[PDB]
């Protein structure tokens, strides 16, 4: 199914910037860590798809809001550095201490409402 997606991709139509960020990062991690295949699996097919994304559907996001796959996010630069360092290198990830400074917003909406966690301990339970 990944080869079918790749064949559909890099066709200038399916390969679009509308794809959510870090999806390519997850694909690269799957291809280089678990599969660990780079023969048309990493730095060859993934690199081709990344180059197509950087050329086709470049600087024209499907949705302008929330910076979806936009160049304003430093996460794109982080993913680019991770992909560059993952092309057959020792410690291929080479990524640590991203220094988010609480910009990721791990807690979802109504995070104050989530902090329900105030009454985490039930009365005479657990």
């Amino acid at each position: 199914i990944f080869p079918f997606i790749k064949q559909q991709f890099i066709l200038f139509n399916d390969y679009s910037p509308m794809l959510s960020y870090e999806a390519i990062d997850y694909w690269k991690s799957l291809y280089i860590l678990l599969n660990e295949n780079l023969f048309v699996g990493q730095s060859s097919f993934k690199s081709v798809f990344l180059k197509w994304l950087k050329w086709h559907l470049y600087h024209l996001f499907s949705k302008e809001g929330e910076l979806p796959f936009f160049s304003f996010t430093d996460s794109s630069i982080i993913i680019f550095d991770l992909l560059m360092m993952i092309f057959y290198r020792p410690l291929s990830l080479s990524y640590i201490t991203t220094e988010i400074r609480s910009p990721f917003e791990r807690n979802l909406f109504h995070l104050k409402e989530a902090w329900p966690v105030t009454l985490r301990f039930p009365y005479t339970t657990d």
């Binding site: 990944f2 080869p3 678990l34 599969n35 660990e36 295949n37 780079l38 023969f39 048309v40 699996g41 730095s43 092309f87 057959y88 290198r89 020792p90 291929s92």
Partner: protein, 509 residues
């Protein structure tokens, strides 16, 4: 060298502890010089899986794999001895021997196991001398065997609530319901009150044979005799766990081995406990102990002369001995010829021919054909067959499919998951695809790290061919990191000039 060779002329099997092995001779041996390591006695690596590798650092496991490949390449150690110690122990003397075995086991547990150890000390302190105290050393007799009646282990609240029992609590319940017929020692607390330690099947399985031997002819009559018969029969056939069946078969064999008092034949002694050996043999075949299944089958056929022919064929199909599959002749039809020719993997009376005829006459096969093609050596034919099956989706497997992925040098087939335990063909394909990719791109550290990751997970499976992968790891490492003279593969056989009885396990691909 003297330390290494004296470590093995006797039994020093006591490094079974996982936390005590990385402290034992598997971290000190790594630091020892490489020349000394080569000069160490061969029995260090003879039992490549007997050592418990549960607790090992990553680097220690990597060193283990490297040295193991190095040791396999010179004088392979696959050949091993077959037999272990017997089970027969050698009337009041018989009972004395049973009690001696039980108390020796109890003393061993006392030495090995602080709360539990104190409880075993109190249990052994539980008073009458039957001359059985002579065999344990007299120091324990003087210290803990006038003596204080008050227990030195628990203070009425310190006692354990008898939890953390084993998955084989079946023998615990059986021993509980069994020993409650004539209580010599309230050894009863060892099974019902001391059942804390997962002991919960160790001591129970250790002396369940002994107490069952005690119960047989314990008195003139006993309902508990029918109880042991019923429980043996109920344990032989079981569901949701093969371990209970394995334990029941172990008790069956242990009782069969014992000398029967006033027994005319060792044969009828094997049938002291009334049971049908055919169902036991079927369970053993389902228990994957095929030699044990054949033993039960032949004892049954010695009694009833009523062997199950289909069961015998199923047993002989998977028997490890190479000259099996021909003990029972199946009356020949166009399926017996094909199956007999598949096993030989021979070109005369071509299994390729019969498979080709059956694939179009439509007269299991989706793997038998591929394996026959691969064994005959027609690798391109097997590549075409695998491609056709993939086109028809009929194979729908990631096994066979990867046997021809690396042999035919097709490096576009995605590799199997590295985390999951995988068959030797997918194993080899993962390693070989990795080395092909890192030959194309040239990153030596990446290849080393990947082979290390893939060799770390292979150990716990207790698969027969783990050492075969250790060899491949060491071999490709030697052939890779060297700047010249990449050989390290034939010279052993050239010195042997023959297979040297290496068996298909040692020499294959």
């Amino acid at each position: 060298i003297e330390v290494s060779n004296k470590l093995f002329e006797r039994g020093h099997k006591r490094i079974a502890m996982n936390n005590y092995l990385c402290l034992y001779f598997w971290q000190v041996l790594d630091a020892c010089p490489r020349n000394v390591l080569h000069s160490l006695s061969l029995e260090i690596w003879k039992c490549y899986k007997a050592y418990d590798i549960t607790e090992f650092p990553d680097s220690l496991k990597l060193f283990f794999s490297d040295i193991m490949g190095w040791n396999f390449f010179k004088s392979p150690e696959i050949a091993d001895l077959n037999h272990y110690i017997p089970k027969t122990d050698p009337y009041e003397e018989s009972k004395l021997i049973i009690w001696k075995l039980i108390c020796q086991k109890a003393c061993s547990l006392l030495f090995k196991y602080i709360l539990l150890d104190s409880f075993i000390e109190d249990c052994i302190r539980m008073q009458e001398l039957r001359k059985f105290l002579n065999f344990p050393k007299d120091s324990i007799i003087y210290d803990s065997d006038t003596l204080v009646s008050e227990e030195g282990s628990f203070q009425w609240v310190k006692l354990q609530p008898t939890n953390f029992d084993s998955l084989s609590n079946w023998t615990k319940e059986e021993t509980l319901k069994l020993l409650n017929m004539m209580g010599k020692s309230s050894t009863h607390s060892l099974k019902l009150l001391s059942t804390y330690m997962v002991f919960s099947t160790s001591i129970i399985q250790y002396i369940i044979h002994l107490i069952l031997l005690e119960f047989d002819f314990n008195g003139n009559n006993k309902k508990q005799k029918e109880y042991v018969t019923q429980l043996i029969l109920s344990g032989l056939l079981n569901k949701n766990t093969n371990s209970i069946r394995k334990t029941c078969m172990n008790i069956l064999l242990y009782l069969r081995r014992q000398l029967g008092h006033h027994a005319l034949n060792p044969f009828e002694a094997n049938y002291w406990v009334p049971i049908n050996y055919s169902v036991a043999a079927s369970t053993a075949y389902d228990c994957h102990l095929y030699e044990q299944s054949l033993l039960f089958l032949t004892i049954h056929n010695t009694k009833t002369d009523e062997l199950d022919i289909t069961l015998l064929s199923d047993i002989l199909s998977q028997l490890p001995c190479p000259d099996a599959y021909y003990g029972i002749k199946r009356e020949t039809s166009f399926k017996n010829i094909l199956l007999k020719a598949v096993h030989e993997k021979r070109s005369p009376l071509a299994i390729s021919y019969l498979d080709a005829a059956n694939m179009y006459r439509s007269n299991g096969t989706k793997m038998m054909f591929s394996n026959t093609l691969n064994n005959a050596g027609f690798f391109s034919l097997n590549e075409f067959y695998i491609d056709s099956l993939k086109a028809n989706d009929a194979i729908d497997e990631c096994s066979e499919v990867y046997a021809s992925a690396w042999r035919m040098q097709k490096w576009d087939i995605p590799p199997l998951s590295l985390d999951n335990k995988t068959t030797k063909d997918c194993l080899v394909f993962e390693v070989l695809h990795a080395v092909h990719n890192y030959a194309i791109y040239g990153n030596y550290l990446h290849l080393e790290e990947y082979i290390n990751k893939k060799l770390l997970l292979i150990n716990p499976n207790e698969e027969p061919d783990s050492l075969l992968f250790y060899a491949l790891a060491y071999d490709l490492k030697f052939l890779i990191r060297c700047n010249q003279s990449q050989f390290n593969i034939l010279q052993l056989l050239k010195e042997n000039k023959q297979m040297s009885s290496q068996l298909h396990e040692c020499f294959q691909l």
